[PDB]
């Protein structure tokens, strides 16, 4: 198997490694066709997350089924599939509550031993446990390059917005115009937002945000809070989706949002805490949610939207590279020279 | 014109000033946990008539008002206009013309309810006729502490079979425990530090937990499969109890913070928050949203909040009431006015 592996902080290389085999009756093996590099993968790259050298990286994929365990009914070898970046068992108390992101046997592909110790997706073959839970057949008229987003960054943004109770007419602020933010912007549009505001600090990304229908706001060059408020009757938006990570942007989200509004925090960060407004919080009536995506809950709806053309996430792909050029990909994406990198696996 | 002020003095009775106004002859008036923040040095009050809990009868109504002078009424402790954008979103607690009776100039500068007469603006919005078979002493709770608790729990998405932890077994917490029961909770936990209050919690059906005598987090977790409860209602106020709520609640659960405090902030878990998948809400009650359902529950006997009243005092004995309630000698004090 050709596969991208971690070597040390900020180093990554493509080596020969063993192809995995079926080990459980609900396993499936997937011949990966495309594999993404995610913002989350940068936390690995920068040693923010513990990984052993020689571990296969990546949790974004689309491909075809090679084989299935004796327990799998609805998947055969030909089948084009996509799956959530995180796995779930389907029988623990959290899975029964449909909170698959809190699965007791939960994990994330290619994210090291603190997250299930799973071999990653940037490779020719992927073992998917409990494939009955963790995979979806592609609808017949859907390109793999579109479908791949359903497994991670699109369902993340979608989920953020549904949990944030976005209703038609609502105004929305999105903090972070990276890939996740850009998914959020597009989705917010199709869910009938009356106005969408994108806050970032990189013109290339703000330009992209604007093309998707948002009012761009450079946080380096102005006070985003003052600006967001004037755009929203001096109240603030009904919903804020924060997609950066960290106390700076979270406090921003909480200041920015209107009284009685909702903040949906979706960005990752290491800080153990941040200051949540109390006295002012009581006056303002805030609803706040923070968490990792629960992709399984949303993936079927996201796929139906992709298949029908309502969403076109692949437009944000700046680079399709061969698997062997992965280390360049990581450098590009890290240095913010690529917007989204997709790896073609031969 | 008898009225409690930040002692009980004579003050001028208010008159109708607008065609939606109503004047209410207050018959019972409560002293609330919120009133204790006034009492101590926490909320600014002009050295003014106190209180926001009332039940009484209609004296008079503006030309624009389903209410006549005989009628027994109750109303939210906070007022709302019914036409501003927040009122139209049914977020009456965020009314742009909003305020809280007898709660000083930072909250609408309104004359309080611990007094013989109350002016109620926009009474079309801010009042309800009592259903025919409902005692005033039961009804009064619909205007403030019962609806507050009820609201906290419905917003916290309490579903039948859920387990619930309530932090604070004061009057609000006790409302929450009784409500949680009637909404089909499988198990309710009450955390406080005062035996009298924990005994009361226990009689209502909760497992009492003394936070002075044991780690409430450990204990709550063992009572809830080592997960934590589905929902936590925090009913005390302040960073200590909020952090407690957030530690205690299970992953993927919900915290509904309803306790008042003046600190500008508290530390919300971030890295651990992401792992946990928390939903958090903090706010002042939106009574108008819930009052109609609460009244139906009261009228039909499903809730009996008046059982927590330890003292019915005459208006004039109010200062002893405040002392008793502050010192934690009374559980709930209701003032009888005429
Ligand atoms: N919650 C989940 O389960 C889940 C799933 C996938 C990704 N994520 C997270 O969501 C975030 C988005 O992923 P991505 O691929 O878009 O990452 P990215 O790093 O490629 O995008 C981040 C964007 O935020 C911008 N930004 C950074 N600091 C900023 C600041 N102070 N003010 C304004 N803008 C700022 C950057 O310029 C960049 O455009 C990451 O934190 C990622 O780990 C979470
Ligand atoms: N959100 C709203 O709109 C709203 C409405 C009504 C009341 N409130 C607030 O709810 C809170 C409770 O109201 P109440 O009338 O029940 O008042 P209360 O003063 O009787 O409640 C305090 C109770 O909490 C317990 N307690 C205090 N600190 C504690 C700690 N560190 N650990 C454990 N237990 C502790 C005490 O034993 C006491 O019984 C008050 O802060 C009040 O302002 C808010
Ligand atoms: Zn990812
Ligand atoms: Zn599970
Ligand atoms: Zn009160
Ligand atoms: Zn209003």
Q: Which two tokens stand for residue B280?
A: 């958090």
CA A281–ligand 6 middle distance (angstroms): 19
Residue B256's SS3 state is strand
Q: Do strands A239-242 and A171-175 pair parallel, antiparallel, or not at all (unpaired)?
A: parallel
Q: Do strands A80-82 and A136-137 pair parallel, antiparallel, or not at all (unpaired)?
A: antiparallel
CB-based burial label for B144 (10 Å; 0-12, 13-18, 19+): buried
| Nearest listed ligand to the Cα of residue B284 | 2
Which residue is it, tokens 């942007």?
A249
Which residue is it, tokens 């309800």?
B128
Q: Is A251 in the pocket of ligand 1 (CB under 6 A)?
A: no
CATH topology of domain A157-291: Rossmann fold (3.40.50)
Q: Look up the CATH superfamily of B149-283.
A: NAD(P)-binding Rossmann-like Domain (3.40.50.720)
| Nearest listed ligand to the Cα of residue B285 | 2
Atom of ligand 1 nearest to the CA of A176: 24
Task: State the Cα–Cα distance between residues B330 and B243, nearest whole angstrom.
Answer: 28
Task: State the Cα–Cα distance between residues B43 and B112, nearest whole angstrom.
Answer: 15
- Chain A hits for B94, Cβ within 8 Å: 259-260, 285
Strand partners, B208: B190
Residue B250's SS3 state is coil
Write the class of the CATH domain B1-148+284-338. alpha beta
Are residues B283 and A281, on separate chains, in Cβ contact within 8 Å? yes
Which residue is it, tokens 């709520």?
B245
Atom of ligand 1 nearest to the CA of A268: 41
CA A85–ligand 4 middle distance (angstroms): 14
CA B76–ligand 5 middle distance (angstroms): 10
Contact A29, A65 (CB under 8 A): yes
> How many Cβ contacts (< 8 angstroms) between chains A and B?
118
Q: Which two tokens stand for residue B37?
A: 């923040």
CA dihedral A119, A151, A188, A174 (to 10 degrees): 0
Q: Is A124 in the pocket of ligand 1 (CB under 6 A)?
A: no
Q: A168 — phi, psi (to 5°)?
A: -55, 140
Query: DSSP for A84-111?
Result: -SEE--SSSHHHHTT-GGG-TT-EEBTS
Q: What is the resolution of this structure in A?
A: 2.7
Are residues A289 and B280, on separate chains, in Cβ contact within 8 Å? yes
Give the DSSP H/E element, type plus range, for residue A133.
helix A131-134
- What share of residues in chain B are helix, strand, coil (percent, to 5)? 35, 25, 40
Task: State the Cα–Cα distance between residues B316 and B18, nearest whole angstrom.
Answer: 31
Q: How many CA atoms lie within 13 A of B98 on its CB side?
A: 22
- Chain B hits for A290, Cβ within 8 Å: 270, 273-274, 277-278
Residues with CB under 5 A from ligand 4 (ion): A 88-89, 92, 95, 103
Rg (CA), chain A: 20
This structure was determined by: X-ray
CATH 3.90.180.10 residue window(s) in chain A? 1-156+292-346
Q: How many angstroms from the chain centroid is the CA of residue A259?
A: 28
Query: DSSP for B106-128?
Result: GGT-B--SSBSEEEETTHHHH-E
Cα–Cα distances in angstroms (integers) from residue B89 to residues A232, B77, B92, B152, in the given order: 15, 19, 8, 18
Give the DSSP H/E element, type plus range, for residue A65.
strand A60-68
Q: Which two tokens stand for residue A47?
A: 């040693």
Are residues A274 and B267, on separate chains, in Cβ contact within 8 Å? yes
Q: Which two tokens stand for residue B29?
A: 């008036």
Task: State the Cα–Cα distance between residues B163 and A109, nearest whole angstrom.
Answer: 33
Q: How many angstroms from the chain centroid is the CA of residue B132?
A: 24
Residue A123's SS3 state is strand
- Mutation choice for ligand 1 from A175, A222, A267, CB with most ligand atoms inside 8 A: A267
Task: State the Cα–Cα distance between residues B283 and A75, nearest whole angstrom.
Answer: 49
- Residues within 6 Å of ligand 2 by CB: B 32-34, 36-37, 144-145, 148, 168-173, 191-194, 197, 211, 235-237, 240-241, 258-260, 284-285
Q: Which two tokens stand for residue B97?
A: 């013309």
Helical segments of B183-264, H only: 195-204, 216-223, 239-248
Contact A196, A188 (CB under 8 A): yes
Whether residue A38 is annotated as binding a ligand: the answer is yes
Chain B nearest C-alpha distance from A33 (Å):
30
Which among A246, A269, A286 is the nearest to B282, CB-wise? A286
CA B35–ligand 5 middle distance (angstroms): 7
**Which are the contacts of A198, defined by CB distance < 8 A and separation ≥ 6?**
A173, A174, A177, A181, A185, A206, A209, A210, A214, A215, A216, A217
Task: Output DSSP code: residue A344.
Answer: E
Are residues A287 and B280, on separate chains, in Cβ contact within 8 Å? yes
Query: Which of A234, A285, A296 is the mutation pick for testing B, counting most B CBs within 10 A?
Result: A285
Query: Which of A40, A162, A273 is the mutation pick for testing B, counting most B CBs within 10 A?
Result: A273
CATH 3.90.180.10 residue window(s) in chain B? 1-148+284-338
CATH 3.40.50.720 residue window(s) in chain A? 157-291
CB-based burial label for B251 (10 Å; 0-12, 13-18, 19+): middle
Contact A174, A185 (CB under 8 A): yes
Q: Look up the CATH superfamily of A1-156+292-346.
A: Medium-chain alcohol dehydrogenases, catalytic domain (3.90.180.10)
| Nearest listed ligand to the Cα of residue A104 | 4
Q: Which two tokens stand for residue B135?
A: 């005692």
Are residues B270 and A250, on separate chains, in Cβ contact within 8 Å? yes
- Quick one: which of B172, B122, B139, B175 has its CA closest to B56? B139
Task: Output DSSP code: residue A20.
Answer: P
CA B166–ligand 4 middle distance (angstroms): 28
Q: Which two tokens stand for residue B155?
A: 């917003």
Are residues A275 and B266, on separate chains, in Cβ contact within 8 Å? yes
């Amino acid at each position: 198997m050709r596969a991208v592996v971690f070597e040390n902080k900020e180093r990554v290389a493509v080596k020969e490694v063993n192809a995995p085999r079926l080990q459980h009756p609900l396993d499936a093996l997937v011949r990966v066709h495309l594999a993404g590099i995610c913002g989350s993968d940068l936390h690995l790259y920068h040693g923010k997350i513990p990984v052993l050298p020689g571990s296969v990286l990546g949790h974004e994929f689309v491909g075809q089924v090679e084989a299935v365990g004796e327990g799998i009914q609805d998947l055969q070898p030909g089948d084009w599939v996509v799956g959530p970046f995180h796995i779930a068992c389907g029988t623990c108390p959290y899975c029964r509550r449909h909170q698959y992101n809190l699965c007791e046997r939960g994990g994330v592909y290619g994210y090291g031993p603190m997250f299930g110790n799973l071999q990653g997706a940037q490779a020719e073959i992927l073992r998917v446990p409990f494939s009955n839970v963790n995979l979806r057949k592609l609808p017949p008229n859907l390109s793999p390059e579109r479908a791949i987003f359903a497994g991670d960054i699109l369902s993340t943004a979608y989920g953020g917005l549904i949990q944030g109770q976005l209703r038609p007419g609502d105004s929305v602020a999105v903090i972070g115009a990276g890939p996740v933010g850009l998914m959020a912007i597009e989705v917010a549009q199709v869910l009938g937002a009356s106005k969408i505001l994108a806050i970032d600090r990189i013109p290339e990304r703000l330009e992209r945000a604007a093309s998707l229908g948002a009012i761009p706001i450079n946080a380096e060059q102005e006070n985003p809070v003052r600006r967001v408020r004037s755009e929203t009757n001096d109240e603030g938006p009904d919903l804020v989706l924060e997609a950066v990570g960290g106390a700076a942007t979270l406090s921003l989200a909480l200041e920015m949002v209107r009284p009685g509004g909702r903040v949906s925090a979706v960005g990752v960060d290491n800080a153990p805490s941040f200051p949540f407004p109390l006295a002012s919080g009581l006056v303002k009536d805030l609803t706040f949610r923070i968490g990792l995506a629960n992709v399984h809950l949303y993936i079927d709806a996201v796929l139906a939207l992709l298949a029908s053309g309502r969403l076109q996430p692949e437009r944000i792909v700046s680079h399709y590279l061969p698997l062997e050029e992965a280390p360049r990909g990581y450098e590009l994406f890290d240095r913010k020279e690529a917007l989204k990198v997709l790896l073609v696996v031969r």
